[PDB]
């Protein structure tokens, strides 16, 4: 079913909401995990995409989520997908009350039902290929000159496009689904200053961790298979300690550890995935500088990460990892109502900043951020949010 | 006592360099005047040169409602004039900005506005006097001169709203902190030091072959 | 005994150290606690001073402590002193090993033996009183003019000074000693980047708290009287919870709470003391802005402080408070070897920055910071650190 | 096609304003030249004018060893010269700084040094060529030209040391990141844009009646 079905299924009945599903343009990028030179299988291609969501109630924004989906291609039909969850945030300016937890879980189900081939149609390459091209390497003078000789010559100032440069791939509808995330609580992630809002409810370290873990537990049951491999990790904690949280998990197979184990290449740099704004990426690059990348075992990596302040002087954070196969076969190219795909980085960023960029120490900003989005989709994109009739009893 | 000499000297220099800088500044203001003159001339023959520049300049769109762009698109011409050329009565940093809107059918009149910005004593803050302009007929709801009471609960609501469009900028003065348009002095300074002085650099970039700039 | 006796008494024997005791010039300042207008007793004067310390081992700095002493005067012989502890910090560049804990405790004993009348001799007023004065209100032009008419007239360029403007007070050698501090662990307080030093040992929230509490426990015994009032407070914790830490304390009278209780004026702003860089000062001023100063009971203050992130998303922090009378009678005007009193704010700051301002991600900075201090005391002040023969068995 | 016209035009302007700024800058460089000339003249009759300015300028003392002040105190004269006046071969931002030390008995010779700073292509970084100077006889221990091996464990030690004095600044070039004097380009820029251009403002402040400024 549609995203629209989903959300409606977890919002109080009779209630009306609106929401935004922005999605970047799938861009061919470098390997999620850092490859090692002399290695049999190194990825053929990595296809990044960003999903960004934001709910609205009564013309105010109150929630937003930022997840990246990465689809890796080793060859003809050896593929693999990874869902990374970067940021979720609220601003406590919702008039009514809702389960942010089920909203988030749902949204992820939905991303989980997506057929990985959706990301495979067009793919903006990492570096593209008769001259006369204006580009980031064209002084204003140059460009103008160009527009001039192109006008004196042709009737107009545009060119020919058939124009196909834009990569294309395929893989098996059912592949290895992964999910990775790093719980860390902060005052706000996507709604600046909203922490200056009283009615905003912040979960602390150990509060976030259970929250998240319930969302993954629910998913491992409903969506993944019974041998799926699930792992938890809590930096600066005891393997006995974790198992005790885990005994709270309805899912049977939750274990201590992570899904990057892999006895093949026992060295951190070639195992740890690298994500936006992630501490894993962080510590990693830290070691790029102080040059220790070819010296820290994955085993060691974990142990060192815990010290070096950050974790040493911050509340409970945990790394969860999933690696299994989905119950149903993911198979959902989303409708125009399911996503909204800006023409460019430029426009994509533009619409996100209408939200993420606003100040929220006053219900003013949340009202602002909503109008400015609908105004804008209508104006520059001939579109508009999705309306929601909430249909969940109690 | 040759020490009482040298000291009296430097003190002269000290009062001077204040007026010396006013000079190196008045020079550049003069050199620039006719150059912008030529350029603007060309610009003036380009269609949608300003419409294009304002929608490409990334920072700009932070300051104003998204709806303002329907009207913003109408901007035939933008001229910056530094006042220190028309009388030593003016701060080297004082200037005016003239706009031209070519309006729209049954919603926005055609007009031309000049708001004036000059500094006021106290290191000196930049400030503005209010200037008239015909708000679009859509912005009837959030028009200040259409609101009976701004202190009424639904009146302060709607006022605060229209104060966030670009038209609410034309009222800005920089003397009612928190009461008027937000950052109106920065915006004015944007125009005067980046948008107008580089309007070309941006038009070139918006002219990039391939959707993705 | 002298500071020099003290430190030597807590450093390993045969071992040699060096240390710096910088002390600001006692400045008449505003009330520690915010006074209320219509109030019978409001302070007559508040006399601030800063003590700053730094130990050296083998020409490297490795520890520094920043404590403020405030002496309040209600009238003729109604006085009161308060020791506030702002910052202590290490950089792990000590070659040998020492008890930073006993170093700190000691240093405080010493400040505790100081006769409050020491701070009472000269006191730079808050606003001082024939013209012709160069001052922060004199353009360079002006000043020069002045130096010119003062030269054409007199043979030189200086003036007359008898010059006595510099306040003077007295109080009873034995007064109400207080001690206040706010434990919060951080990567570094006085040694920038030293957290990039591996060998540097950081205590976490619950680790700092016991550390500090042991230092005060030791002091309440050895130095204070048996009815002294001692209080602990742990934001976001349970009165039962604290009592359980407290049951670890050798001192009998440790209770939950703080020493600002005072049923007289049950309103936060008129009870909470205001210190450098303090969260108490912080939250307070926060409420000055959002205007709630005349609306939050001291009772409420505590309760609200715990939320509003900071504490909500940081490890264990505690507020300790003391209020009693000292066993012995404090009575020690310190020697030139006990303190070093810069001519001015300007020079004081100057010498502190030689340390606090240095980078410490390399033993380079700690070596640097030492030399630059001895070089400088010698040069511009005709002085030099104190040498220490450590005399503590084991 | 009048559009092909206006475009070719702006492009001319674009290549011009680059050379136009070189002009407004060369103007100020010229206006300033003789003014500093007068001033320096006065300064030159004041005793310990420079000694005083350098010890009062707060930021300055961050960059150099504390011991350097015994020698720093000896600084009779500091002159800044902008190279863009002596040949269009020079970046408007290029300049030289001349110092005069009057040395000390049996430790520091009397000398006068001019280090030269100009920008190098690649937005362009500021850089320097090494220039000779007689390090004090105390700085024998940490003298580079007194160290047999800088790669030896006790040699890299002692080298790194003398590289932190002001004399280690005179070697700085801005091409051996991490190897030479720390922030040597910022320091040079300090002199050229703050210390020399305001040397007076600071001397006035150090002249405050009452120990506490
Ligand atoms: C890896 C990543 O994705 S990281 C993103 C981390 N983000 C942040 O830290 C941003 C700050 N945190 C937040 O903004 C939010 O608290 C969230 C999104 C983490 C959680 O939102 P919440 O609305 O608090 O949670 P949700 O609405 O699902 O309900 C959670 C619990 O709080 C309760 N709750 C909801 N609103 C409130 C409130 N105002 N006060 C107290 N409790 C509340 C719910 O009953 C529920 O408790 P229960 O389990 O006892 O029924
Ligand atoms: C209110 C205020 O004043 S706030 C100031 C807060 N400051 C900071 O947070 C700065 C960061 N913290 C630090 O720099 C330091 O850890 C301090 C000053 C807090 C403590 O210093 P330490 O040297 O760790 O403590 P100290 O030397 O007294 O010994 C403490 C414990 O650590 C042990 N220890 C000392 N060095 C090390 C080391 N390198 N590794 C492990 N343990 C060590 C000691 O044995 C002792 O343990 P014990 O009680 O089991 O015997």
In sequence order, which residues have a C-beta less than 8 Å from that of residue A299 and are 6 or more positions away?
A266
Taking alpha carbons only, the member of A263, A333, A252 closest to residue A298 is A263
Taking alpha carbons only, the member of C352, C350, C379, C378 closest to residue D69 is C379
Q: Rounded to whole angstroms, how far apart are CA atoms D213 and D63? A: 23
Question: A186 vs C313: CB contact, 8 Å cut-off?
Answer: yes
Q: Which two tokens stand for residue C18?
A: 């060096």
C160 and chain D: CB distance < 8 Å anywhere?
A: no
In sequence order, which residues have a C-beta less than 8 Å from that of residue A156 and are 6 or more positions away?
A150
Q: What is residue B82's three-state secondary structure? A: strand
Q: What is residue D92's three-state secondary structure? A: coil
Q: What is the DSSP string of C226-273?
A: TT-EEEEE-TT--HHHHHHHHTT-SSS--EES-TT--SSS--GGGTSB
> Roughly how many angstroms between the first and final C-alpha of chain C, as a whole number?
23
Taking alpha carbons only, the member of D188, D175, D163 closest to residue D97 is D188
Q: Rounded to whole angstroms, how far apart are CA atoms C21 and C327? A: 25
| CB-based contact A63:A90 (threshold 8 Å) | yes
| CB-based contact B135:B86 (threshold 8 Å) | no
Please give the distance of CA A281 from its chain centroid, rounded to a whole number.
15
Q: Which two tokens stand for residue B183?
A: 């950052």
Taking alpha carbons only, the member of C36, C133, C40 closest to residue C78 is C40
Q: What is residue D176's three-state secondary structure? A: coil
Which residues pair with residue A363 across a beta bridge? none
Could you tell me whether strands D125-128 and D111-120 are parallel, antiparallel, or unpaired per DSSP bridges? Answer: antiparallel
> Beta-carbon neighbour count of residue D101 at 10 Å?
21
Q: Rounded to whole angstroms, how far apart are CA atoms B60 and B183? A: 12
Q: Rounded to whole angstroms, how far apart are CA atoms A109 and A19? A: 17
> Beta-carbon neighbour count of residue B8 at 10 Å?
18
Question: D4 vs A152: CB contact, 8 Å cut-off?
Answer: yes
Tokens 């918006």 -> residue: B206
> Beta-carbon neighbour count of residue B23 at 10 Å?
13
Could you tell me whether strands B125-128 and B111-120 are parallel, antiparallel, or unpaired per DSSP bridges? Answer: antiparallel
In sequence order, which residues have a C-beta less than 8 Å from that of residue C345 and are 6 or more positions away?
C24, C25, D212, D213
Nearest to A187 among C185, C205, C313 (CB): C313
B87 backbone φψ class: left, alpha, beta (φ>0; ψ -120 to 50)? left
Q: Considering A38, A278, A361, A375, which one is annotated as catalytic?
A: A278
Q: What are phi and psi of C254, to 5 degrees?
A: -45, 120
Tokens 């009183």 -> residue: C129
Q: What is the DSSP string of B1-47?
A: -HHHHHHHHHHHHHHHHHHHHHHHHHHHHHHHHHHHHHHHHHHTTST
Query: Which residues does chain D have within 8 Å of residue C381's beta carbon, measured at their own beta carbons?
Result: none
Question: B39 vs D10: CB contact, 8 Å cut-off?
Answer: yes
| CB-based contact B31:B166 (threshold 8 Å) | no
Question: A312 vs C204: CB contact, 8 Å cut-off?
Answer: yes
Tell me the CA–centroid distance for residue A386 and ligand 1, in Å: 24
Residue whose CA is at the smallest distance from ligand 2 atom 1: C183
C28 and chain D: CB distance < 8 Å anywhere?
A: no
Q: Is the Cα dihedral D181, D185, D188, D194 positive or negative?
A: negative
A153 and chain C: CB distance < 8 Å anywhere?
A: no
Query: Which residues does chain A have within 8 Å of residue D15's beta carbon, measured at their own beta carbons?
Result: 141
Tokens 């995935």 -> residue: A273
Taking alpha carbons only, the member of A251, A245, A256, A255 closest to residue A225 is A251
In this structure, chain C runs to a length of 394
Q: Is the CB of C317 under 6 A from ligand 2?
A: no
| CB-based contact A112:A102 (threshold 8 Å) | no
- State which H helix or E strand residue C19 sits in: strand C16-23
CA distances from B14 to A351, B27, D197, D213 (A): 52, 21, 11, 21
Which residues pair with residue B99 across a beta bridge? B78, B113
Nearest to D200 among C140, C345, C350 (CB): C140
In sequence order, which residues have a C-beta less than 8 Å from that of residue A290 and are 6 or more positions away?
none
Q: What is residue A129's three-state secondary structure? A: coil
- State which H helix or E strand residue D80 sits in: strand D75-82
CA distances from A276 to A43, A66, A281, A357 (A): 20, 10, 7, 18
In sequence order, which residues have a C-beta less than 8 Å from that of residue D204 and are 6 or more positions away?
C138, C139, C140, C143, C144
Q: Rounded to whole angstroms, how far apart are CA atoms D171 and D187? A: 13
> Beta-carbon neighbour count of residue B208 at 10 Å?
17
Q: Rounded to whole angstroms, how far apart are CA atoms A354 and A370? A: 8
- Helical residues (DSSP H) of chain A, grouped into ranges: 3-8, 100-113, 140-153, 205-222, 239-246, 279-289, 298-306, 345-356, 363-381
Print the SS3 string covering C102-125: HHHHHHHHHHHHCCCCHHHCCEEC
Q: What is residue A155's three-state secondary structure? A: coil
In sequence order, which residues have a C-beta less than 8 Å from that of residue D84 and are 6 or more positions away?
D25, D26, D29, D90, D91, D92, D93, D94
Nearest to B35 among D6, D13, D32 (CB): D13
In this structure, chain A runs to a length of 394
| CB-based contact A32:A46 (threshold 8 Å) | yes
- Helical residues (DSSP H) of chain C, grouped into ranges: 3-8, 100-113, 140-153, 205-222, 239-246, 279-289, 298-306, 345-356, 363-381
Give the number of whichever ligand sits closest to the CA of residue C91. Answer: 2
Q: Considering C238, C278, C338, C361, which one is annotated as catalytic?
A: C278
Q: Rounded to whole angstroms, how far apart are CA atoms A378 and A358? A: 20
Q: What are phi and psi of A351, to 5 degrees?
A: -80, -30
Atom from ligand 1 closest to the CA of residue A181:
1
Interface of A with B in 73-132 (CB under 8 A): 124
Residue whose CA is at the smallest distance from ligand 2 atom 12: C202
Q: Rounded to whole angstroms, how far apart are CA atoms C16 and C387? A: 7
Query: Which residues does chain C have within 8 Å of residue A202's beta carbon, measured at their own beta carbons?
Result: 309, 312-313
In sequence order, which residues have a C-beta less than 8 Å from that of residue A330 and are 6 or more positions away?
A112, A113, A114, A115, A116, A173, A174, A177
CA distances from B12 to A23, B8, C153, C385, D38 (A): 65, 7, 20, 46, 11
> Beta-carbon neighbour count of residue B141 at 10 Å?
10
Could you tell me whether strands A16-23 and A386-389 are parallel, antiparallel, or unpaired per DSSP bridges? Answer: antiparallel
- State which H helix or E strand residue A65 sits in: strand A61-73
Q: Rounded to whole angstroms, how far apart are CA atoms C45 and C388? A: 38
Give the number of whichever ligand sits closest to the CA of residue C186. Answer: 2
Q: Is the CB of A316 under 6 A from ligand 1?
A: no
Choose the residue to mutate in C52, C65, C100, C184 for probing ligand 2, maximizing ligand atoms within 8 Å of C-beta.
Answer: C100
Question: C314 vs A309: CB contact, 8 Å cut-off?
Answer: no
In sequence order, which residues have a C-beta less than 8 Å from that of residue B34 and are 6 or more positions away?
none
Which residues pair with residue A230 across a beta bridge? A322
Nearest to C141 among B1, B4, B14 (CB): B14
Taking alpha carbons only, the member of C197, C175, C181, C167 closest to residue C60 is C197
D196-206 vs D2-43: helix crossing angle, rounded to 10: 40
In this structure, chain D runs to a length of 213
On the CB side of D84, CA atoms within 13 Å amount to 18
Tell me the CA–centroid distance for residue A102 and ligand 1, in Å: 11
Taking alpha carbons only, the member of C200, C6, C251, C205 closest to residue C106 is C6
Q: Is the Cα dihedral C358, C360, C362, C364 positive or negative?
A: positive
Tell me the CA–centroid distance for residue C201 and ligand 2, in Å: 6
CA distances from A392 to A59, A61, D43 (A): 21, 20, 84
Taking alpha carbons only, the member of A43, A40, A17 closest to residue A30 is A43
- Helical residues (DSSP H) of A16-161, grouped into ranges: 100-113, 140-153
Documented resolution in Å: 3.3
Taking alpha carbons only, the member of A19, A42, A18 closest to residue A31 is A42
DSSP state of A34: P
Q: Which two tokens stand for residue B121?
A: 């004593």
- State which H helix or E strand residue D158 sits in: helix D153-162
Taking alpha carbons only, the member of B152, B85, B97 closest to residue B129 is B97
Question: B66 vs A376: CB contact, 8 Å cut-off?
Answer: yes
Q: Is C361 designated active site?
A: no
Give the number of whichever ligand sits closest to the CA of residue C315. Answer: 2
Q: Rounded to whole angstroms, how far apart are CA atoms C14 and A21? A: 71
Q: Give the gap in angstroms from C-alpha C238 to the nearest C-alpha of chain B.
A: 42
Query: Which residues does chain A have within 8 Å of residue D7's beta carbon, measured at their own beta carbons?
Result: 144-145, 147-148, 151
C290 and chain B: CB distance < 8 Å anywhere?
A: no
Q: Is the CB of C278 under 6 A from ligand 2?
A: no
CA distances from A255 to A181, A208, A214, A236, A251 (A): 16, 19, 15, 17, 10
């Amino acid at each position: 079913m549609s995203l629209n079905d989903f959300l409606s299924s977890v919002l109080p009945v009779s209630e009306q909401f609106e929401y935004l599903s922005l999605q970047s343009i799938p861009l061919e990028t470098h390997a999620v995990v850092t490859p090692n030179k002399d290695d049999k299988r190194v990825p053929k291609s990595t296809i990044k995409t960003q999903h960004f969501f934001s709910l609205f109630h009564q013309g105010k924004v109150f929630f937003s989520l930022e997840v990246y989906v990465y689809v890796t291609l080793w060859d003809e039909a050896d593929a693999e997908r990874l869902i990374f969850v970067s940021k979720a945030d609220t601003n406590g300016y919702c008039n009514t009350r809702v389960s942010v937890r089920d909203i988030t879980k749902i949204i992820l189900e939905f991303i989980l039902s997506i057929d990985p081939n959706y990301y495979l149609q067009k793919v903006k390459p990492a570096i593209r290929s008769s001259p006369e091209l204006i580009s980031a390497a064209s002084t204003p003078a140059r460009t103008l000159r160009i527009l001039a000789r192109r006008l004196k010559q042709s009737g107009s100032t545009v060119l020919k496009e058939q124009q196909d440069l834009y990569l294309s791939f395929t893989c098996p509808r059912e592949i290895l689904t992964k999910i990775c995330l790093f719980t860390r609580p902060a005052s706000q992630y996507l709604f600046p200053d909203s922490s200056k809002n009283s009615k905003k409810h912040i979960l602390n370290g150990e509060e976030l961790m259970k929250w998240w873990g319930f969302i993954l537990d629910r998913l491992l049951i409903e969506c993944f298979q019974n041998d799926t491999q699930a792992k938890l990790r809590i930096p600066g904690e005891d393997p006995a300690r974790v198992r005790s949280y885990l005994r709270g998990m309805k899912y049977p197979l939750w274990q201590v550890g992570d899904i990057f184990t892999s006895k093949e290449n026992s060295l951190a740099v070639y195992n740890i995935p690298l994500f936006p704004d992630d501490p894993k990426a962080r510590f990693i690059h830290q070691l790029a500088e102080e040059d220790r990348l070819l010296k820290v075992s994955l085993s060691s990596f974990w142990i060192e990460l815990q010290e070096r302040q950050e974790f040493k002087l911050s509340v409970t954070s945990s790394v969860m990892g999933i690696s299994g196969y989905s119950l149903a076969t993911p198979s959902l190219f989303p409708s125009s109502a399911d996503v909204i795909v800006p023409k460019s980085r430029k426009q994509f960023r533009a619409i996100k900043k209408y939200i993420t960029g606003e100040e929220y120490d006053t219900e003013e900003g949340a009202i602002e951020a909503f109008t400015n989005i609908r105004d804008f989709l209508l104006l520059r994109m001939a579109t508009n949010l999705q309306s929601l009739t909430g249909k969940r009893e109690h | 006592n040759e020490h009482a000499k040298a000291f009296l000297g430097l003190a002269k220099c000290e009062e001077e360099v204040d007026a010396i800088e006013r000079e190196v500044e008045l020079y550049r203001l003069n050199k620039m005047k006719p150059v912008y003159e030529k350029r603007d001339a060309y610009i003036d023959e380009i269609a949608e040169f300003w419409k294009i520049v304002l929608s490409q300049h990334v920072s700009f769109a932070n300051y104003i409602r998204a709806s303002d762009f329907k009207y913003i698109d109408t901007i035939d011409k933008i001229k910056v004039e530094w006042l220190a050329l028309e009388s030593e009565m003016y701060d080297t940093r004082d200037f005016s900005i003239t706009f031209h809107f070519h309006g729209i059918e049954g919603d926005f009149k055609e007009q031309q506005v000049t708001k004036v910005f000059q500094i006021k004593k106290g290191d000196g803050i930049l400030t503005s006097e209010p200037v008239p302009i015909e708000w679009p007929q859509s912005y009837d709801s959030i028009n200040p001169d259409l609101i009976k009471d701004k202190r009424s609960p639904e009146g302060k609501k709607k006022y605060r709203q229209g104060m966030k469009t670009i038209f609410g900028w034309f009222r800005w003065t920089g003397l009612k902190p928190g009461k008027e348009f937000p950052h109106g002095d920065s915006l004015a300074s944007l125009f005067s030091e980046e948008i107008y002085p580089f309007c070309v650099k941006y038009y070139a970039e918006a002219q990039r072959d391939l959707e993705d700039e």
